[PDB]
Amino acid sequence: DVNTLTRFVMEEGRKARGTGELTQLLNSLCTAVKAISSAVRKAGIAHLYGIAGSKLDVLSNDLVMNMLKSSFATCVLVSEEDKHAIIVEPEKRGKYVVCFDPLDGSSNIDCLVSVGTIFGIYRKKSTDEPSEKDALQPGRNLVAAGYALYGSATMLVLAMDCGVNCFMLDPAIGEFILVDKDVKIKKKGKIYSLNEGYAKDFDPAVTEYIQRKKFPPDNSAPYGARYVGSMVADVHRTLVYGGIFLYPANKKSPNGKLRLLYECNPMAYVMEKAGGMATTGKEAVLDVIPTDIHQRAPVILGSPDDVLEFLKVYEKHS
Amino acid sequence: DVNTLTRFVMEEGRKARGTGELTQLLNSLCTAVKAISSAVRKAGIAHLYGIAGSKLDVLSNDLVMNMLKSSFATCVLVSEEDKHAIIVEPEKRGKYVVCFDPLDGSSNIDCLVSVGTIFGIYRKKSTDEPSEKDALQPGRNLVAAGYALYGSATMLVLAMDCGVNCFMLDPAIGEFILVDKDVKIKKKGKIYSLNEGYAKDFDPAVTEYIQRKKFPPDNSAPYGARYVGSMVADVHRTLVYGGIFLYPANKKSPNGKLRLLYECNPMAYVMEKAGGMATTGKEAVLDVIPTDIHQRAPVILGSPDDVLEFLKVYEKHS
Amino acid sequence: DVNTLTRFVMEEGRKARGTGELTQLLNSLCTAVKAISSAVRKAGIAHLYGIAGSKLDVLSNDLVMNMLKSSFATCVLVSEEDKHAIIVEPEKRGKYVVCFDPLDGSSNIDCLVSVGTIFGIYRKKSTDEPSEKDALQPGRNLVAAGYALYGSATMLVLAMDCGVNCFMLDPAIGEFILVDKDVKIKKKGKIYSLNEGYAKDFDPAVTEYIQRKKFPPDNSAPYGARYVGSMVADVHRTLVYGGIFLYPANKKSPNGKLRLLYECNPMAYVMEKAGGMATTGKEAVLDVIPTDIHQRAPVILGSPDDVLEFLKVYEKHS
Amino acid sequence: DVNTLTRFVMEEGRKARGTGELTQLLNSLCTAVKAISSAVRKAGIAHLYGIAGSKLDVLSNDLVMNMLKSSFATCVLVSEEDKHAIIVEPEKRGKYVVCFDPLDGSSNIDCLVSVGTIFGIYRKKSTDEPSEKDALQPGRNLVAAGYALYGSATMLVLAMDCGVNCFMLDPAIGEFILVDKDVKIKKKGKIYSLNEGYAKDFDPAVTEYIQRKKFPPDNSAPYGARYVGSMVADVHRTLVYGGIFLYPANKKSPNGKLRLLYECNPMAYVMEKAGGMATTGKEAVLDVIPTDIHQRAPVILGSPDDVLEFLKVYEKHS
Ligand SMILES: COc1cc(-c2ccc(OC)nc2)c2oc(NS(=O)(=O)c3cc(Cl)ccc3Cl)nc2c1
Ligand SMILES: COc1cc(-c2ccc(OC)nc2)c2oc(NS(=O)(=O)c3cc(Cl)ccc3Cl)nc2c1
Ligand SMILES: COc1cc(-c2ccc(OC)nc2)c2oc(NS(=O)(=O)c3cc(Cl)ccc3Cl)nc2c1
Ligand SMILES: COc1cc(-c2ccc(OC)nc2)c2oc(NS(=O)(=O)c3cc(Cl)ccc3Cl)nc2c1
């Protein structure tokens, strides 16, 4: 049969027999994502350019922020665009905390590079008056996670207890159509993605691991390399074709470059649910316990075999 | 004021007081790109997944192929998807030879990677019955050229005698708005783009040049690295952000992998018009004379300072 | 705050605490309407005219039909396009019966006149295997009714226990936006609607009533006249501006022309929910008991005052 | 083959070999209609309802007004929305005068009724400073005229010296696809269109005519009655299905309700270029010399045979 994000979600709801909040939460995220998408493809740019006579980062955040509060199922929201965690008014409070990057990669949206949105959904654990504390939970506590990629087409990838599901947006009818049910990442891929410009600053294990793909020790064929620069773009390619995505610590700080709460955990969750791995070299991303909401983390994720190899080598130099 | 692609071309047309063929030619190509873009963003994908009850490479090709023959401005079309050159029917012949790649990067559209259309437009030179011999001209003969980028937004870059112009597609009204008049490229960028997988097969000049970006001799900051794997994308970022794009010759062949007529020349011609550089290592891309319509050619292009720098290193190993 | 059909429907579900079926049903319904609208506005008409090189009544029905079956919330469906009731396969059965008119007004879609979709939702009462017998319920047993109007813009009017609501489709984000809460009709309007072509065949009661409009007895001001030809459009105009719509019996037969199950029952129901009136002249449309699923029925709906005037002039002739 | 509005016009302009102005005039107008159409189908209504967190007549006027000015082909512009005629700056002056109704039927856009843009293009005769005077020309002097219809689908009808042509707007690729070449209207139809709420004030000549439609003298079949209440729609129907449209003089004034400059003339011009007829009862609409740019005129247009019958009756009462 044919299936859509709303139908897929609704059903999962029924089976689950819950409160309905998550179904309502996820749905708002959905409307937001499309609204966002509408703007990213330059909806009515003509109007701004005087067709009638007379920032996208911020708008994206307002959409998401506003659609969630209206959901009535949120209490604490964190966004790569806000200094502190936004605390939802008493009248519209729910039981879920949402951590998200409204439009990741925006900085490079000038060259029409693929940009995306990332979201992670937790269930508030404590009974205290909401605060940012409710957002400092380990990726391992995620209820649902996913991202929307505004590429050649707009795709939304949702990961839940069941597994990962890929929906494509039919812009003609504003509907997310299921085009990939219960995904599973290749055991081993042949493409590695990482900014090799930071080479002079890599640790020796990352340096060796790279050498290992350029010049396979077992004289196998060398891996291919791709690096969009946009996390969602790169991570999604790694899910589809398999492979390995790296953004390890270096000179910036052994604390890594990507954010834990709304970039790392979310993807790790999706990766792990698809059957891959997502580590920091020292432990599992999802096992890492947040301290501050914009806290960074090193990330290595992709096909199981690849991540394990990296770790094999990481142990070597440890 | 506010201008569109059509209006833009129309005023240039009145200025030069020509026949109007090129104007029509460009318009057809324009509607062709709008068609392609609708397809790429998955317009009516729901009707393909049973909403009513019951390739993107060929679809795009048919679109360009049809559109152009309909304009009455062409006589010889050369496409990446077609083996031989299509010789237009005698009732729809014009005085223009068009070479193009309807959908580049098409081989990786699975991961929703950006894709683009590339096109070069020549003026049939001889008076002989139209044959593929008519597409065997050097890029320096180009009359107009450019590409379409189906990324986050849909942009069309048109390079002609006058300059390089960027037009954004307001999907809401299917119209191309000028957003960047007479574009020029930085003198020196800070990003290098090539596939570092083939490292085992890079020729030393390319190997050493890459070493210097990672470990700059003058201890300056190292360049950043990016590689989408789609020519339109990478080349467009190079134009917008400045920098250097590499696809040199090695083992595959002393000729590189990209094809001369519908990939290099157009891209090399846009660069040069934007005041940039495009070389094969031994000569300017626009100066190489074609032997066959599918002829391959090595390419290195981008900011002058960076292209010159590479050429300095290339010279060191010759 | 802002609200959409989906969010409005989900919170109604949460109030009522039910199985969730009717929610998926409306939702399934909502999707079909966006797709029908998409096609009605001629989505990709370019392609059928050869832009690439080489029915609406049917499609509308196919969509609705296929989306409803997929909801898992229906057991028997009735369409003005199918002669026998359709019994949903056992694997997709729900507890609801849906009688609808995919695209009413179609015949005249050649002139681009407005058109629409009418739908009525009944709950199954008996336990006998589903048959068209479960579709012969008086309009008075409707659980939910509604219609979509593909006019200058696309609107969806949903009527339920709680009353009437209007939603506008935002084509850019594929979302239905609530723009009129708990709609109530005027007590008295200034427009009468009917095809004055069948004048030579009007029964006296109707010929007198029309006189009363063109030459008001109390010498008040004459009512205006409007007849689109598309019921959905007429009735909607009536509901919004107030007045009286008439499609009474005559030579054709003391049954009128319109269908009771999927044309009159839904409008009449929406009307009585808006505080208006809808009679056949002998009784109330909703009180009429069906014998055949394609049974015709006389209709007069609109502002309470205007409708009562008819009934008074109707009694003067009985 | 396949053709677009822009291709059509460019081919007409190349044939004739004019100055090119008319060609830009047309495409500028085309662009406005696409924009209007977008706003009419409620492009981004979601935003104004707070999906982000925080007049259609006027806008339509600003789009046409600006696009025409920005064309460099006009000198005098008459609009229903402006009291005086707008005299184009001396820098953007062209040799054409354009009258138009930015969005006829807007007063009723509440019920979602069909609406449309009407336009007429006169060439400026004199060498005098452009003024309101230059728009005072007889329909007989039109150069191009047409109208956009925002019904169930958006179509633009263009009538010129060569004939009448209908273009269907394919909202997916943002282009107008020619779907009806050299249109011609039925010699006779079966639908009469007029507001019968004014029966009380009709003159006898018109009352008798309406009588012969309900009770045909040659006991033929009665004509159908259709009145949408929006000129563009009642006229487009007449043009597509044949029949006759009436808006004769009444109590309002022996001059009628419709405006001659931007409502009657255009319509009148299409009817005649399509075989039809347009009269004020006393003379061909296209032969009336205007005194004021907002001058009104009685109109009866449609199929020849139908209009002549009216004219036969009209004389019987003169
Ligand atoms: C189709 O509409 C419905 C009906 C029911 C529902 C729940 C209980 C019940 O009583 C037995 N009857 C209906 C729902 O419960 C829920 N619970 S929930 O928290 O939103 C949820 C959503 C998802 Cl993606 C996955 C798991 C869960 Cl846990 N959604 C529903 C949607
Ligand atoms: C309004 O659109 C017009 C009017 C005229 C045109 C040409 C001569 C003329 O004689 C007075 N009057 C008008 C055009 O000529 C041309 N010539 S052309 O070959 O297509 C052309 C297109 C471009 Cl991108 C740039 C230069 C030239 Cl060379 N396009 C026209 C478009
Ligand atoms: C998607 O959100 C939800 C949650 C619940 C639901 C029901 C019980 C419960 O236990 C606390 N928690 C949630 C629903 O029940 C229903 N019942 S229902 O039959 O579909 C329905 C839909 C509408 Cl338009 C109006 C009344 C009713 Cl009767 N829809 C739900 C949607
Ligand atoms: C799109 O390309 C072209 C080329 C030429 C054009 C004109 C003269 C010329 O000299 C040989 N070469 C080219 C045009 O002239 C015109 N003249 S015009 O006034 O705009 C016009 C437009 C239409 Cl709808 C119909 C008749 C006329 Cl009269 N449009 C052109 C468009």
Residue among A79, A57, A58 nearest A68 (CA): A79
Q: Report yes or no: B157 and B8 within 8 Å, Cβ to Cβ.
A: no
Both B206 and B283 in one domain: the answer is yes
Residue among C144, C125, C145, C127 nearest C135 (CA): C125
Instruction: Return the structure tokens found at D77.
Output: 């512009």
Q: How many domains does chain A have?
A: 2
Instruction: Return the structure tokens found at D189.
Output: 């139809």
Residue identifier of the C-alpha nearest atom 5 of ligand 4? D14
Query: What's the burial of D177, exposed, middle or buried (CB within 10 Å: 0-12/13-18/19+)?
Result: buried
CA-to-CA distance for A147 and B277, rounded, in angstroms?
A: 38
**Which residues share a beta bridge with C146?**
C119, C158
Nearest CB to C2; choose among A70, A172, A175? A70
| Final residue in a domain of this structure, among B135, B155, B182 | B182
* Neighbouring residues of B311: CB distance < 8 A, sequence distance ≥ 6: B279, B281, B300
CA-to-CA distance for A164 and D206, rounded, in angstroms?
A: 71
* Neighbouring residues of D309: CB distance < 8 A, sequence distance ≥ 6: D209, D212
Q: Report yes or no: B212 and B204 within 8 Å, Cβ to Cβ.
A: no
Cβ-defined contact of D174 to B13 (cutoff 8 Å): no
CA–centroid distance for D224 within its chain? 23
Residue identifier of the C-alpha nearest atom 10 of ligand 2? B17
CA-to-CA distance for D166 and D153, rounded, in angstroms?
A: 12
Residue among C125, C124, C126, C107 nearest C115 (CA): C107
> Which residues have C-beta atoms less than 6 Å from ligand 4?
B 13, 19-20, 23; D 9-10, 12-14, 16-23, 26
CA-to-CA distance for D303 and B134, rounded, in angstroms?
A: 54
Both C269 and C120 in one domain: the answer is no
Both C4 and C149 in one domain: the answer is yes
Cβ-defined contact of D66 to A59 (cutoff 8 Å): no
Cβ-defined contact of B31 to D172 (cutoff 8 Å): no
3 state SS for chain A: CCCEHHHHHHHHHHHHCCCCHHHHHHHHHHHHHHHHHHHHCCCCHHHHCCCCCCCHHHHHHHHHHHHHHHHCCEEEEEECCCCCCEECCHHHEEEEEEEEEEEECHHHHHHCCCEEEEEEEEECCCCCCCCHHHHCCCHHHCCEEEEEEECCCEEEEEECCCCEEEEEEECCCCEEEEEECCCCCCCCCCEEECCHHHHHHCCHHHHHHHHHHHCCCCCCCCCEECECCCHHHHHHHHHHCCCEEEECCCCCCCCCCEEHHHHHHHHHHHHHHHCCEEECCCCEHHHCCCCCCCCEECEEEECHHHHHHHHHHHHHCC
Give the resolution in Å.
2.8
Both C7 and C122 in one domain: the answer is yes
- Residue D57: count other Cβ atoms within 10 Å of its Cβ: 18
Q: What is the CA radius of gyration of chain A?
A: 20
**Residue that has been written with the tokens 């609009």 in this structure:** D79
Both C214 and C300 in one domain: the answer is yes
Q: Report yes or no: D194 and D159 within 8 Å, Cβ to Cβ.
A: no
Instruction: Return the structure tokens found at D65.
Output: 């007004």
Q: Which amino acid is located at B284 in the chain?
A: A
> Which residues have C-beta atoms less than 6 Å from ligand 2?
B 9-10, 12-14, 16-23, 26; D 19-20, 23-24
C95 secondary structure, DSSP code: S
Q: Report yes or no: A141 and A163 within 8 Å, Cβ to Cβ.
A: no
Residue among D229, D76, D237 nearest D147 (CA): D237
Sign of the C-alpha dihedral, residues D191, D193, D197, D198? negative
A10, A28, A150, A178: which to substitute to probe chain C, counting the most C Cβ within 10 Å?
Answer: A10
Instruction: Return the structure tokens found at C264.
Output: 């009159």
Q: Which amino acid is located at A300 in the chain?
A: I
**Residue that has been written with the tokens 């029409």 in this structure:** A112
Helix (H, G, I), strand (E, B) or coil at C50: coil
How was this structure obtained? X-ray
Q: What is the maximal distance between C-alpha atoms in chain D? A: 66
Nearest CB to D52; choose among A46, A63, A172? A63
Sign of the C-alpha dihedral, residues D201, D205, D207, D209? negative
**CATH no. for residue A314?**
3.40.190.80
**Which residues share a beta bridge with B296?**
B259
**Which residues share a beta bridge with D225?**
D192
Residue among C209, C206, C126, C121 nearest C158 (CA): C121
Nearest CB to D10; choose among B4, B23, B66? B23
Cβ-defined contact of B173 to D35 (cutoff 8 Å): yes
**Which residues share a beta bridge with C92?**
none
CA-to-CA distance for A236 and B109, rounded, in angstroms?
A: 12
Both D28 and D174 in one domain: the answer is yes
Ligand nearest to the CA of B30: 2
* Neighbouring residues of C145: CB distance < 8 A, sequence distance ≥ 6: C119, C120, C121, C159, C160, C265, C266, C269, C270
Sign of the C-alpha dihedral, residues D134, D137, D141, D145? positive
How many residues are given for chain D?
318
Helix (H, G, I), strand (E, B) or coil at B79: strand
Best probe residue, ligand 4, of D7, D22, D164 (max atoms within 8 Å of C-beta): D22
**CATH no. for residue A120?**
3.30.540.10
Q: What backbone phi and psi angles, to 5 degrees, belong to C269?
A: -65, -45
| Beta strand ranges found along chain C (DSSP E) | 74-79, 86-87, 96-104, 115-123, 142-150, 154-160, 163-170, 175-180, 191-193, 224-225, 244-247, 277-279, 299-302
| Final residue in a domain of this structure, among A182, A211, A243 | A182
D192 secondary structure, DSSP code: E
Residue among B151, B194, B177 nearest B302 (CA): B194
Both A139 and A1 in one domain: the answer is yes
Both B267 and B156 in one domain: the answer is no
Instruction: Return the structure tokens found at C92.
Output: 């997709």
What strands lie across the sheet with B164-170, from one edge to the other? B86-87, B74-79, B96-104, B115-123, B144-150, B154-160, B164-170, B175-180
Q: Report yes or no: C309 and C292 within 8 Å, Cβ to Cβ.
A: no
Instruction: Return the structure tokens found at B302.
Output: 């981008």
CA-to-CA distance for B255 and B298, rounded, in angstroms?
A: 5
CA-to-CA distance for C303 and C247, rounded, in angstroms?
A: 15
Both A168 and A294 in one domain: the answer is no
CA–centroid distance for D69 within its chain? 21
CA-to-CA distance for C50 and C196, rounded, in angstroms?
A: 42
Both B214 and B317 in one domain: the answer is yes
Q: Report yes or no: B138 and B272 within 8 Å, Cβ to Cβ.
A: no
Instruction: Return the structure tokens found at A305.
Output: 């075999």
Q: Which amino acid is located at C173 in the chain?
A: I
Cβ-defined contact of B43 to C43 (cutoff 8 Å): yes
CA-to-CA distance for B28 and B6, rounded, in angstroms?
A: 10
| Beta strand ranges found along C207-312 (DSSP E) | 224-225, 244-247, 277-279, 299-302
Instruction: Return the structure tokens found at C17.
Output: 């605490």
Q: Which amino acid is located at A98 in the chain?
A: V
Both A15 and A149 in one domain: the answer is yes
CA of A24 to the centre of ligand 1 (A): 10
Residue identifier of the C-alpha nearest atom 30 of ligand 4? D13
CA-to-CA distance for B200 and B198, rounded, in angstroms?
A: 5
CA-to-CA distance for D15 and D30, rounded, in angstroms?
A: 20
Show the domain range for C125.
1-182
Helix (H, G, I), strand (E, B) or coil at B71: helix
Helix (H, G, I), strand (E, B) or coil at B115: strand
Residue among A186, A181, A193 nearest A241 (CA): A186
**Residue that has been written with the tokens 């009538």 in this structure:** D159
Residues of D with Cβ-Cβ distance to C172 under 8 angstroms: 43-44, 46
Q: How many CA atoms lie within 13 A of B314 on its CB side?
A: 18
Residues of D with Cβ-Cβ distance to A62 under 8 angstroms: 52-53
CA-to-CA distance for D91 and D107, rounded, in angstroms?
A: 35
Both A158 and A227 in one domain: the answer is no
Q: What angle do CA D65, D69, D74 make, to 5 degrees?
A: 110
Best probe residue, ligand 1, of A17, A30, A176 (max atoms within 8 Å of C-beta): A17
Chain D residues with CB under 8 Å of a chain A CB are 31, 35, 38, 43-44, 46, 50-53, 59, 62-63, 65-67, 172
Show which subunits contact C, needing at least 3 CB pairs below 8 angstroms. Answer: A, B, D
CA-to-CA distance for D316 and D295, rounded, in angstroms?
A: 28
Residue among A279, A190, A284 nearest A237 (CA): A190
* Neighbouring residues of C24: CB distance < 8 A, sequence distance ≥ 6: A7, A10, A11, C71, C72, C73
| Final residue in a domain of this structure, among A137, A160, A182 | A182
Show which subunits contact D, needing at least 3 CB pairs below 8 angstroms. Answer: A, B, C
